[PDB]
Design an enzyme around this catalytic site. Structure first.
Site, PDB file in Angstrom:
ATOM      1  N   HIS A  40     -16.679  11.632 -39.739  1.00 24.00           N
ATOM      2  CA  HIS A  40     -16.365  10.431 -39.076  1.00 24.00           C
ATOM      3  C   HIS A  40     -17.215   9.393 -39.065  1.00 24.00           C
ATOM      4  CE1 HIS A  40     -18.572  12.468 -35.588  1.00 24.00           C
ATOM      5  NE2 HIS A  40     -19.038  11.435 -35.597  1.00 24.00           N
ATOM      6  N   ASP A  84     -15.288  18.374 -40.535  1.00 24.40           N
ATOM      7  CA  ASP A  84     -16.038  17.008 -40.388  1.00 24.40           C
ATOM      8  C   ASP A  84     -17.386  16.967 -41.337  1.00 24.40           C
ATOM      9  OD1 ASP A  84     -16.650  14.600 -39.436  1.00 24.40           O
ATOM     10  OD2 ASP A  84     -17.627  15.128 -37.491  1.00 24.40           O
ATOM     11  N   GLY A 175     -24.990   8.220 -31.749  1.00 28.64           N
ATOM     12  CA  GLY A 175     -26.213   7.826 -32.839  1.00 28.64           C
ATOM     13  C   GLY A 175     -26.759   9.039 -33.418  1.00 28.64           C
ATOM     14  N   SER A 177     -24.738  11.896 -34.660  1.00 26.88           N
ATOM     15  CA  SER A 177     -23.456  12.310 -35.280  1.00 26.88           C
ATOM     16  C   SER A 177     -23.912  12.074 -36.959  1.00 26.88           C
ATOM     17  CB  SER A 177     -22.415  11.406 -35.241  1.00 26.88           C
ATOM     18  OG  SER A 177     -21.781  11.631 -33.963  1.00 26.88           O
ATOM     19  N   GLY A 178     -23.590  13.337 -37.684  1.00 26.03           N
ATOM     20  CA  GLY A 178     -23.837  13.077 -39.213  1.00 26.03           C
ATOM     21  C   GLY A 178     -25.266  13.831 -39.314  1.00 26.03           C
TER      22      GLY A 178
HETATM   23  C1  LIG Z   1     -18.506   6.039 -36.507  1.00 28.04           C
HETATM   24  C2  LIG Z   1     -19.598   6.002 -35.673  1.00 28.04           C
HETATM   25  C3  LIG Z   1     -20.181   4.735 -35.768  1.00 28.04           C
HETATM   26  C4  LIG Z   1     -19.099   6.193 -34.394  1.00 28.04           C
HETATM   27  O1  LIG Z   1     -19.624   7.444 -33.777  1.00 28.04           O
HETATM   28  C5  LIG Z   1     -19.773   7.895 -32.446  1.00 28.04           C
HETATM   29  C6  LIG Z   1     -18.816   6.795 -31.349  1.00 28.04           C
HETATM   30  C7  LIG Z   1     -18.995   7.488 -30.048  1.00 28.04           C
HETATM   31  C8  LIG Z   1     -19.753   8.797 -29.701  1.00 28.04           C
HETATM   32  C9  LIG Z   1     -20.334   9.445 -30.740  1.00 28.04           C
HETATM   33  C10 LIG Z   1     -20.800  10.838 -30.185  1.00 28.04           C
HETATM   34  N1  LIG Z   1     -20.890  11.418 -29.216  1.00 28.04           N
HETATM   35  C11 LIG Z   1     -21.430  12.423 -29.380  1.00 28.04           C
HETATM   36  C12 LIG Z   1     -21.580  13.447 -28.508  1.00 28.04           C
HETATM   37  C13 LIG Z   1     -22.583  14.528 -28.790  1.00 28.04           C
HETATM   38  C14 LIG Z   1     -22.873  15.652 -28.187  1.00 28.04           C
HETATM   39  N2  LIG Z   1     -23.462  16.606 -28.669  1.00 28.04           N
HETATM   40  N3  LIG Z   1     -22.730  15.574 -26.619  1.00 28.04           N
HETATM   41  C15 LIG Z   1     -22.810  14.536 -30.289  1.00 28.04           C
HETATM   42  C16 LIG Z   1     -22.696  13.616 -31.266  1.00 28.04           C
HETATM   43  C17 LIG Z   1     -21.892  12.435 -30.573  1.00 28.04           C
HETATM   44  N4  LIG Z   1     -21.574  11.494 -31.101  1.00 28.04           N
HETATM   45  C18 LIG Z   1     -20.178   9.000 -32.005  1.00 28.04           C
HETATM   46  O2  LIG Z   1     -20.686   9.893 -32.957  1.00 28.04           O
END
Ligand SMILES: CC(C)COc1cccc(-c2nc3cc(C(N)=[NH2+])ccc3[nH]2)c1[O-]
Ligand SMILES: [Ca+2]
Ligand SMILES: [Cl-]
Length: 223
Positions: A40, A84, A175, A177-178
Site C-alpha cells: 500500500h 501487503d 509515516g 508503514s512499509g
Molecule cells: C500510501 C501512504 C502514503 C498512506 O499511508 C497511510 C495513511 C494513513 C495511515 C497510515 C497508517 N496508519 C497506521 C497505523 C499503524 C499502527 N500500528 N497503529 C501502523 C501503520 C500505519 N499506517 C498509512 O500508512
C-alpha cells in the site's frame, strides 16, 4: 512511532525512507539493489533514501537512488491489506558500509513473546500529527494469535501478526508503514496497519515476512 525513543544516527543501517518530494513510507534494505516495503506504499516517482537520520537535513551518509521498478505482490488486496508486501529494485546498487547495510530474511517465523525493534519517521502522537526529523525506535513483543484475533476479529489473515502493547501508549503510526520489524537480527514484519495509533487493545498489525521468503527469493532471482 508513538512512545518510542531516538534511535541514534545510523544505528538502524537497513532502514530506508521512500520519498516523492516528502517522506511517505519506510522500507528495509535486503541486498544492495532491493528494498522490501508494504504494497500500500506503492506509487510511481519513488526515490529511496538510505543512510538517513534527520530526513530534512543532508548530514552525510545519505545515498538517494531512484527505484527502477516496484513489484507489488500479485495477490495484494487493498481492502483487507492481505499480502501487503512490495519489492522495489534500485536503479543502481547502494554502497554498503556500516551506516548502510542490509538485514537478513528469516528462516523461520518468530513466536509470540519475541521482542523486536520497529523504527520509522512516522507520527509520534496518537491524537494529532507531530512528525519527527530523526529516526524513532520502539522495542515491542509479538503477541499471540489469540490476542490478535480477539482485538481485530475477522481481520487477521495467516499473513499478519500483531506486535505491541494492549495497554496503549507505544505503537507504530502513520509515516511508519512499509518499515521493518526486526527480531533476533532477522526481518520478521513490515509495518502494515492498526486502528488509530497506540490505542488500548488495538495493537499494530504487521505483514508476516516468513510466509514470503520463497516469493521474495524467486522474484529477485527472475528480475
Ligand atoms: C500510501 C501512504 C502514503 C498512506 O499511508 C497511510 C495513511 C494513513 C495511515 C497510515 C497508517 N496508519 C497506521 C497505523 C499503524 C499502527 N500500528 N497503529 C501502523 C501503520 C500505519 N499506517 C498509512 O500508512
Ligand atoms: Ca538527512
Ligand atoms: Cl476470526
Amino acid at each position: 512511532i508513538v512512545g518510542g525513543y531516538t534511535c541514534g544516527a545510523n544505528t538502524v543501517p537497513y532502514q530506508v525512507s521512500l520519498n516523492s518530494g516528502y517522506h511517505f513510507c519506510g522500507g528495509s534494505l535486503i541486498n544492495s539493489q532491493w528494498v522490501v516495503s508494504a504494497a500500500h506504499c506503492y506509487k510511481s516517482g519513488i526515490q529511496v533514501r538510505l543512510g538517513e537520520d534527520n530526513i530534512n537535513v543532508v548530514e552525510g551518509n545519505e545515498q538517494f537512488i531512484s527505484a527502477s521498478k516496484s513489484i507489488v505482490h500479485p495477490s495484494y488486496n487493498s481492502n483487507t491489506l492481505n499480502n501487503d508486501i512490495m519489492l522495489i529494485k534500485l536503479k543502481s546498487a547502494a554502497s554498503l558500509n556500516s551506516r548502510v547495510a542490509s538485514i537478513s530474511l528469516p528462516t523461520s517465523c518468530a513466536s509470540a513473546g519475541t521482542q523486536c525493534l520497529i523504527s520509522g519517521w512516522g507520527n509520534t502522537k496518537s491524537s494529532g500529527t507531530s512528525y519527527p526529523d530523526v529516526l524513532k525506535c520502539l522495542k515491542a513483543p509479538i503477541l499471540s494469535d489469540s490476542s490478535c484475533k480477539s482485538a481485530y476479529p475477522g481481520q487477521i489473515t495467516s499473513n499478519m501478526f500483531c506486535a505491541g502493547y494492549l495497554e496503549g501508549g507505544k505503537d507504530s503510526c502513520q509515516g511508519d508503514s512499509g518499515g521493518p520489524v526486526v527480531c533476533s537480527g532477522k526481518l520478521q514484519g513490515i509495518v502494515s496497519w492498526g486502528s488509530g495509533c497506540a490505542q488500548k487493545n488495538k495493537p499494530g498489525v504487521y505483514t508476516k515476512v516468513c510466509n514470503y521468503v520463497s516469493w521474495i527469493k524467486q522474484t529477485i532471482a527472475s528480475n
